[PDB]
């Protein structure tokens, strides 16, 4: 009925999944085996359990995902580590060769013999999922098999299912973490094919995640065991809103209803409210009204941009922990009085209230806060037109004299598909100016 299947591919899809399924199974209180405690945990109580999970015939719970990666070294961390018995080996697909910073390899020529097995095995999940709610894929822009498999993946589900929506929570690398020189190439070749298939994309940008961990944590080490902590807390916002019966349910089509004014642009922001690292003892637990007064002013370090000079389209908040609803509506009057919040001329409507029950649970060992006040708004702005002007400027000047072009052509790409992808993004950059018109 209300079940859904997420997909976790790539180096930025399993390292996130190693910080999410640990975070999912800590809310329900699930052992590394997967057995259930004696907190009246025999069958589903008042809380819905099988949003991400499944109750097997052996009495325990089985999570449901898609683990596909080309390198066998990453799945060997999963097939040996903490959760080595939650995941059935049918949902553990390993390739042999590598994409190797090449969109052309990961698209089809290594997808020739994996997607015939993936689509065989998500068809296995048809009898184990009577009702589907959609898909949530994790991958990376600008890389190898994260950009390679993703443009293959959306083509083979829209023919099989079609009606089911999908949100991508994608990552392009940073100037601080620059693992390839073709990073503008592999990013724009998967906002080309996926732009006719993606419904909401969250630009989880390492160029601004690392700026948070520089200021709020004072840790200048861009490691994948502390940067993936900050990302998985944002995913945990949407998680309990479809798992636990919150105060106000936000459905998947209902969330897309307010964030997608035109289906062409459909790029909202992951403006999560940044918190402070409490290492031993917090000096002051902030309240609900103190977050949203100064949340989106340092949440502009999520996509490194300037929302204070563009124009907004909408906004949708999502609360975790214990939040009294009458305390919410006092702080919104001050920010509405200010002129910094600038909407379009055709929609001055404020926001949406979404309140859940549980606080964001904390794995020990991390460098984050143990709180119960959590605010996560997810808004869409016309200020990120100049965010894509950076990548097109990083795409124009590796291409005016045709540098690095032969590596894609050497594995099967034509020269026109560059200019096809550029012209499909020069319109999209002008689409935001087309929306933000004072008429």
């Amino acid at each position: 009925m209300r079940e859904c299947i997420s997909i976790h591919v790539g180096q930025a899809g399993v390292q996130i999944g190693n910080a999410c399924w640990e975070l999912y199974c800590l809310e329900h209180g699930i052992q590394p085996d997967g057995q259930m405690p004696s907190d009246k945990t025999i069958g589903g109580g008042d809380d819905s359990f099988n949003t991400f999970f499944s109750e097997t015939g052996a009495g325990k719970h089985v999570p449901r995902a898609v683990f596909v990666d080309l390198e066998p070294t990453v799945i060997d961390e999963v097939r040996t580590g903490t959760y080595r018995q939650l995941f059935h080996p049918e949902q553990l697909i390993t390739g042999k060769e590598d994409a190797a910073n090449n969109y052309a390899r990961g698209h089809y020529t290594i997808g020739k013999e994996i997607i015939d097995l993936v689509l065989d095995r998500i068809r296995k999940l048809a009898d184990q999922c009577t009702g589907l709610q959609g898909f949530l894929v994790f991958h990376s822009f600008g890389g190898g098999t994260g950009s390679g498999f993703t443009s293959l993946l959306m083509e083979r589900l829209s023919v099989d299912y079609g009606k089911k929506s999908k949100l991508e929570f994608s990552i392009y690398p940073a100037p601080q973490v620059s693992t390839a020189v073709v990073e503008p190439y592999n990013s724009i070749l998967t906002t080309h094919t996926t732009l006719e298939h993606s419904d909401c994309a969250f630009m989880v940008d390492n160029e601004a995640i690392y700026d948070i961990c520089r200021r709020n944590l004072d840790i200048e080490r861009p490691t994948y065991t502390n940067l993936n902590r900050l990302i998985s807390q944002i995913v945990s916002s949407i998680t309990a809103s479809l798992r636990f019966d919150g105060a106000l349910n936000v459905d998947l089509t209902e969330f897309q209803t307010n964030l997608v004014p035109y289906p062409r642009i459909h790029f909202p922001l992951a403006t999560y409210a940044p918190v402070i690292s409490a290492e031993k003892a917090y000096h002051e637990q902030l309240s609900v009204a103190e977050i949203t007064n100064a949340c989106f002013e340092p949440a502009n370090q999520m996509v490194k941009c300037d929302p204070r000079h563009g124009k907004y389209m909408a906004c949708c908040l999502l609360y975790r922990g214990d939040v009294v609803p009458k305390d919410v509506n006092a702080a919104i009057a001050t920010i509405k009085t200010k002129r910094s919040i600038q909407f379009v001329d055709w929609c001055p409507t404020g926001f949406k209230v979404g309140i859940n029950y549980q606080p964001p649970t904390v794995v020990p060992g991390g460098d984050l806060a143990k709180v119960q006040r959590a605010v996560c708004m997810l808004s869409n702005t016309t200020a990120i037109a100049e965010a894509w002007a950076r990548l097109d400027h990083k795409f124009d000047l590796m291409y005016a004299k045709r540098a690095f072009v032969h590596w894609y052509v050497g594995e099967g790409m034509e020269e026109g598909e560059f200019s096809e992808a550029r012209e499909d993004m020069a319109a999209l950059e002008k689409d935001y100016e087309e929306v933000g018109v004072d008429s």
Binding site: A100, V181, L397, W407
Partner: protein, 425 residues
Amino acid sequence: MREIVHIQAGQCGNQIGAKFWEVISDEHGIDPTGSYHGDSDLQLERINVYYNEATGNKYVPRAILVDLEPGTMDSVRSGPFGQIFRPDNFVFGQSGAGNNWAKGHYTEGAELVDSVLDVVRKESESCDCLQGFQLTHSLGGGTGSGMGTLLISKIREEYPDRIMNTFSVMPSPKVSDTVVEPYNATLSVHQLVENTDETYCIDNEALYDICFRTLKLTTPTYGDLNHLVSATMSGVTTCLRFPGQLNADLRKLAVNMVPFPRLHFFMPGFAPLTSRGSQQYRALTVPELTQQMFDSKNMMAACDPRHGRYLTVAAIFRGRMSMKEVDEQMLNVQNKNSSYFVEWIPNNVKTAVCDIPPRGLKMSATFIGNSTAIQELFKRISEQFTAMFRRKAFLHWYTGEGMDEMEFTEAESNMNDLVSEYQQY
């Protein structure tokens, strides 16, 4: 999965392939009798990259080692680097070509490739993914440039999907045998450039100019210069079994280092620059060797990095050191010198830090650059070749050996086109 078949030929190939093994068997800490005695699991999971498997912590380190003359084959089997590998890879020849590129390529050198290619057909089916072919040879000799260039074509037409790199050795006027070889040079570059992907440009014009001035080794041997080149060849292949933030596999190294459609000759740099065991050196501090990577003298190719505008600047660091100072000292260069590194790639690769130190150095570095300073190793060969050729001097050593007179003209004009291709400023 990630298997590498290695091959080498010639005197210079065999006087470095022994020097290549002794460095990597002490950075990984490998016992030279066939066994292994180490402690870290960094040096133990990646044992299937070069090496085969056998019980009792033993194996056979596969690398095809071949030359026609038996004096070289009997000189790399003596010491503890001799009994390390497989005796069935003893592939030698009958009559060594006396620094003749023609006998090593057409008449005599094209005979025992079937005894070499049969070895490669058996070291390919046993592995599961072959991720490269490496080659070490001299660019101006006999079977090092004859057979070693021919065996590229015999495999590239059979395994075309494999990225191939060659550890190239340009000859020099100062250190010289069979005194005149611009004929042996450009015939060995022409079939290399048309058939390879990565090419490390090592020359003896710069490996003797440093020892004449900096290390003060005025009259060295080949083995004194074999020590210098065998320190970089471990500084390159440390991104193969010591992973890091830059997972820098050879195919990923191929994409991240080749901008133009044709290959280019890489110009590696180095750590603080001494010989083996020499004292009077400071602590290997991180901000000091930034000047030692971008030096106008610390280059493994005789060039001019003050004029050669940089294209790819991927420098691998080795040793437990501070990650913060690495990111800051690189920003004292591109933010102050816009002509040295220029505008082609946003966010070019500038670091890859390894923790395992090399055997003898703690917190070292390895610079690998590529720029238009490699014009001068194309102009100095061609000007010494056009004096050889416009009088048709020494022509008769190849024409009676089954060659063509006009194959010189292409290999001359192929090199002149490279220089005009480098004025893309």
